[PDB]
Amino acid sequence: NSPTMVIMVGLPARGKTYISTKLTRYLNFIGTPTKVFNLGQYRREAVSYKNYEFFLPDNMEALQIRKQCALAALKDVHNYLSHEEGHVAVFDATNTTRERRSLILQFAKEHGYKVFFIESICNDPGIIAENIRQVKLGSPDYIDCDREKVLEDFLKRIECYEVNYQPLDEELDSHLSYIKIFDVGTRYMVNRVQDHIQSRTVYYLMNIHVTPRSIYLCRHGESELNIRGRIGGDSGLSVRGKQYAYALANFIQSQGISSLKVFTSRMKRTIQTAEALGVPYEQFKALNEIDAGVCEEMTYEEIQEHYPEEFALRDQDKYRYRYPKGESYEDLVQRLEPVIMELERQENVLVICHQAVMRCLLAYFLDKSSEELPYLKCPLHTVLKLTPVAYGCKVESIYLNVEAVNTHREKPENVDITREPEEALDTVPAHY
Amino acid sequence: NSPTMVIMVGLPARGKTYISTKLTRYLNFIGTPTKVFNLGQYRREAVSYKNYEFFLPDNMEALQIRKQCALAALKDVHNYLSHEEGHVAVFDATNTTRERRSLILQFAKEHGYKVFFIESICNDPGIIAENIRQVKLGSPDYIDCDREKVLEDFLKRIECYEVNYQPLDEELDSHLSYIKIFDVGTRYMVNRVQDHIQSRTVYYLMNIHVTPRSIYLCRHGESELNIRGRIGGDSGLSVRGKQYAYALANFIQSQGISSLKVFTSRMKRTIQTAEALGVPYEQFKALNEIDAGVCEEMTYEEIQEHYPEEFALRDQDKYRYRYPKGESYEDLVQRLEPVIMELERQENVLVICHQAVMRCLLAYFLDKSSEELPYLKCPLHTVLKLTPVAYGCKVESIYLNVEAVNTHREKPENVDITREPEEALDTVPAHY
Numbered sequence: 001n002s003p004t005m006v007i008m009v010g011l012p013a014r015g016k017t018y019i020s021t022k023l024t025r026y027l028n029f030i031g032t033p034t035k036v037f038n039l040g041q042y043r044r045e046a047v048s049y050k051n052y053e054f055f056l057p058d059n060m061e062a063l064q065i066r067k068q069c070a071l072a073a074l075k076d077v078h079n080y081l082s083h084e085e086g087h088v089a090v091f092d093a094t095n096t097t098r099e100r101r102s103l104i105l106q107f108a109k110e111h112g113y114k115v116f117f118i119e120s121i122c123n124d125p126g127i128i129a130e131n132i133r134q135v136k137l138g139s140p141d142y143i144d145c146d147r148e149k150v151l152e153d154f155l156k157r158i159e160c161y162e163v164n165y166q167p168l169d170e171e172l173d174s175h176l177s178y179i180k181i182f183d184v185g186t187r188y189m190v191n192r193v194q195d196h197i198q199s200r201t202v203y204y205l206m207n208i209h210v211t212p213r214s215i216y217l218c219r220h221g222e223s224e225l226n227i228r229g230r231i232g233g234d235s236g237l238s239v240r241g242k243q244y245a246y247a248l249a250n251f252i253q254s255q256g257i258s259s260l261k262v263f264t265s266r267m268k269r270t271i272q273t274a275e276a277l278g279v280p281y282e283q284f285k286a287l288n289e290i291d292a293g294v295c296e297e298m299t300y301e302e303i304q305e306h307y308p309e310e311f312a313l314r315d316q317d318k319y320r321y322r323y324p325k326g327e328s329y330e331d332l333v334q335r336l337e338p339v340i341m342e343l344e345r346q347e348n349v350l351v352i353c354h355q356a357v358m359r360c361l362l363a364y365f366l367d368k369s370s371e372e373l374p375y376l377k378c379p380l381h382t383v384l385k386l387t388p389v390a391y392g393c394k395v396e397s398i399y400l401n402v403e404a405v406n407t408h409r410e411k412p413e414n415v416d417i418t419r420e421p422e423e424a425l426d427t428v429p430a431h432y
Numbered sequence: 433n434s435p436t437m438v439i440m441v442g443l444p445a446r447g448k449t450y451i452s453t454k455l456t457r458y459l460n461f462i463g464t465p466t467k468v469f470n471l472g473q474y475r476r477e478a479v480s481y482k483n484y485e486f487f488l489p490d491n492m493e494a495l496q497i498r499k500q501c502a503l504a505a506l507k508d509v510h511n512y513l514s515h516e517e518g519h520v521a522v523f524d525a526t527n528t529t530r531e532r533r534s535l536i537l538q539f540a541k542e543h544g545y546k547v548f549f550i551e552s553i554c555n556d557p558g559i560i561a562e563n564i565r566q567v568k569l570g571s572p573d574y575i576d577c578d579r580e581k582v583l584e585d586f587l588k589r590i591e592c593y594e595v596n597y598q599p600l601d602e603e604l605d606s607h608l609s610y611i612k613i614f615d616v617g618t619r620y621m622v623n624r625v626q627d628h629i630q631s632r633t634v635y636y637l638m639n640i641h642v643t644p645r646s647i648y649l650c651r652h653g654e655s656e657l658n659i660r661g662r663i664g665g666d667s668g669l670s671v672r673g674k675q676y677a678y679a680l681a682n683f684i685q686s687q688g689i690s691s692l693k694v695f696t697s698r699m700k701r702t703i704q705t706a707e708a709l710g711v712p713y714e715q716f717k718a719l720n721e722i723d724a725g726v727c728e729e730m731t732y733e734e735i736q737e738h739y740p741e742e743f744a745l746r747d748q749d750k751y752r753y754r755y756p757k758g759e760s761y762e763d764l765v766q767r768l769e770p771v772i773m774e775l776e777r778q779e780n781v782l783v784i785c786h787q788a789v790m791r792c793l794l795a796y797f798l799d800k801s802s803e804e805l806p807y808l809k810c811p812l813h814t815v816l817k818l819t820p821v822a823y824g825c826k827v828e829s830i831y832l833n834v835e836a837v838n839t840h841r842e843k844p845e846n847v848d849i850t851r852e853p854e855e856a857l858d859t860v861p862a863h864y
């Protein structure tokens with residue numbers, strides 16, 4: 001109903017920006033327009049580089065900048081939620097003083113925005129050390145210049161902040177809605193979840209982690225309907241599909257993965273591919289391939305022939321459009337939520353799925369736009385190794401040397417309802 | 433993998449048995465075989481009625497009973513999870529002493545069961561007073577005998593327990609996995625969620641409440657395919673369907689409901705029915721009617737005719753069996769989880785859905801067996817008013833005086849693959 005401001009709270013190197021990023025994507029992915037407002041960003045668009053002195057309490061000159069940055073950011077927050085139609089604005093900054101939060105609660109009150117706080121609390125020198133190593137050594141601020149000096153300036157930077165740090169108080173802040181995250185998710189305290197969005201966020205946040213691992217995404221081996229250029233259905237693996245299943249298992253074994261979890265759909269082709277691994281795996285009805293409704297099992301030609309208007313309209317909006325009695329990519333994404341969440345909770349996991357399902361998952365992990373999503377390239381017999389990294393995720397494409405047919409169909413240059421068959425089928429790949 | 437024991441912790445009249453009940457059902461509903469072990473039950477199968485003195489600390493005689501009851505219960509817990517294949521055994525008792533819990537953690541350790549604690553903490557005389565009013569005045573113990581004396585004996589009963597009460601300690605119990613619920617869900621503290629089942633439980637528990645409200649379940653008004661005796665599809669409302677939509681709105685208005693929330697599917701018939709109310713409502717793709725795959729839009733006759741083996745096998749296991757390219761009731765239930773949860777978070781809500789969807793929802797709220805579920809009677813143009821009550825839920829069937837066709841098809845006496853058409857269609861209701 002009314003927009004929301006999610007307020008990050010915590011000392012530097014507590015993973016606020018990491019949590020800001022992840023949550024923002026998650027929410028956006030499930031249909032909630034969210035944007036992050038990072039103060040550190042604003043700051044750099046202001047003064048500049050050198051010292052932790054800029055963070056010194058006596059530095060009144062510095063405090064104005066930071067104060068003007070906070071208000072600039074709020075300006076943006078307002079027009080984002082009030083004029084641009086955003087749903088959630090995440091305020092990413094230390095916000096360590098009751099004072100600062102009040103400023104915020106105030107602004108919120110004025111504009112009628114609900115407020116939820118996320119406080120990341122961690123007092124393990126180890127954890128913080130790694131955080132600085134991991135993300136601060138290469139922060140823009142520290143144009144990779146110094147050595148251990150970066151640490152020096154940062155530990156100091158933190159200290160500045162430790163001075164007036166006023167954590168959310170269970171008594172004084174009793175009325176506020178928030179979640180305190182302790183020791184990278186070991187313990188949590190949740191107070192006053194007001195609504196859906198908040199019940200949701202708490203859920204997401206209490207289910208993500210920072211344990212290094214890899215996510216391998218791939219489709220089932222080439223299927224009989226694949227070879228025939230027909231979409232959907234529940235065909236089994238082709239000979240080539242069966243060969244890939246074992247090339248995959250060979251690859252997986254070569255990766256020397258610690259306790260790998262395997263997920264499949266309830267569809268035969270993914271299950272059969274899983275069997276090749278000789279390890280237990282789990283089936284998820286939610287990973288089944290998108291459903292084409294009336295075009296289930298057709299060839300693009302038969303679709304152009306029987307449902308030409310649908311065909312062109314779908315090409316006009318592949319993300320939202322549905323074939324009669326079928327799902328849209330938007331639909332699939334919604335249905336995939338539970339899986340995405342399970343993927344967050346897992347460490348090393350291999351997911352054997354389908355072309356459309358896989359596009360959704362990649363779009364999620366690689367932050368592609370919904371516009372982009374229905375068109376990602378998910379070739380058969382190719383493994384995509386996803387390695388999450390602080391704010392981000394690298395990806396490696398690994399072809400497993402077993403030929404298969406090509407199922408990627410690019411957007412035709414002509415998507416008009418009155419376009420002609422050839423114009424509508426000119427991007428269809430060769431199928432047997 | 434290994435079973436789990438969920439341990440209820442808390443003073444009497446904190447809603448432990450209420451939480452035990454709800455969670456057990458929830459879990460069972462989502463595919464996790466859970467059973468409750470209520471000690472109060474065991475006790476009554478032992479000594480008997482009269483005093484709070486049975487709960488007096490000096491009462492060593494009483495303590496043995498209670499001690500033998502706890503071990504009896506544990507015996508059962510073991511054979512339930514170790515021989516009967518249960519997945520979660522919920523230990524419902526005060527378990528207010530570190531001692532008692534150790535006994536439990538011990539037993540657990542011995543048998544290799546994971547352990548999670550749920551501590552209900554509430555220090556509002558008001559809240560507790562109502563609880564005693566609400567559930568204790570009519571407890572078996574207090575064969576509705578006394579008046580305010582019941583209270584007397586109960587407040588005293590609680591006191592006995594207050595003496596040695598040792599809440600979970602954030603330091604001493606740091607290693608344990610648990611969730612502390614404060615003031616009927618206002619604040620929560622979660623420590624060390626180990627796995628899926630636990631991440632799940634926390635979610636459920638942090639999303640249910642005890643605010644009195646009603647849940648109205650009904651189908652869309654009679655549809656065109658309804659009138660034709662055809663299943664599935666996305667037909668619109670019949671004239672009668674359109675008349676019911678407004679009889680419904682009339683009824684809803686007559687109930688004088690405070691802020692009623694309305695949910696529909698993405699299917700036309702439920703949406704059209706919603707329109708009649710003149711209030712905003714929300715569409716949920718997950719409420720769409722079960723999908724019949726290849727029998728989508730057929731009449732039972734056409735199904736018997738084209739897929740006779742499927743037809744009989746489905747009659748053999750209507751819950752698990754799937755029509756080619758279609759869902760099973762089991763499937764539907766899984767897909768409905770998100771909705772059930774949203775229903776828990778809502779207060780007054782009206783759900784306009786479909787025959788199979790509605791059976792699932794009723795089965796959930798009325799605790800019917802999966803065997804029973806696919807056969808519940810969900811007549812058209814009839815509203816089912818569900819009123820949750822402490823451990824339970826009453827239900828009222830309200831016919832809205834607009835005729836519609838009958839779509840209930842009972843299980844045939846003959847479900848053999850070799851049974852004959854007439855034998856397979858003899859329970860089909862009249863359709864136009």
Ligand SMILES: Nc1ncnc2c1ncn2[C@@H]1O[C@H](COP(=O)(O)OP(=O)(O)OP(O)(O)=S)[C@@H](O)[C@H]1O
Nearest residue numbers: 012013014015016017018120122131134184210390
């Ligand atoms: N709850 C957590 N506690 C501690 N570290 C975490 C947590 N969650 C994520 N991290 C780590 O935090 C690091 C990233 O830290 P940042 O997000 O830069 O912290 P931040 O300094 O609070 O963000 P800025 O200052 O707004 S850029 C990565 O190493 C993450 O693994």
Ligand SMILES: Nc1ncnc2c1ncn2[C@@H]1O[C@H](COP(=O)(O)OP(=O)(O)OP(O)(O)=S)[C@@H](O)[C@H]1O
Nearest residue numbers: 444445446447448449450552554563566616642822
């Ligand atoms: N977190 C909560 N705190 C306080 N009361 C609650 C809570 N959740 C449910 N209730 C109420 O608790 C009452 C039922 O109490 P019980 O479950 O009998 O408590 P209990 O006495 O802990 O259970 P026994 O003694 O094992 S039968 C109903 O009024 C519920 O509304």
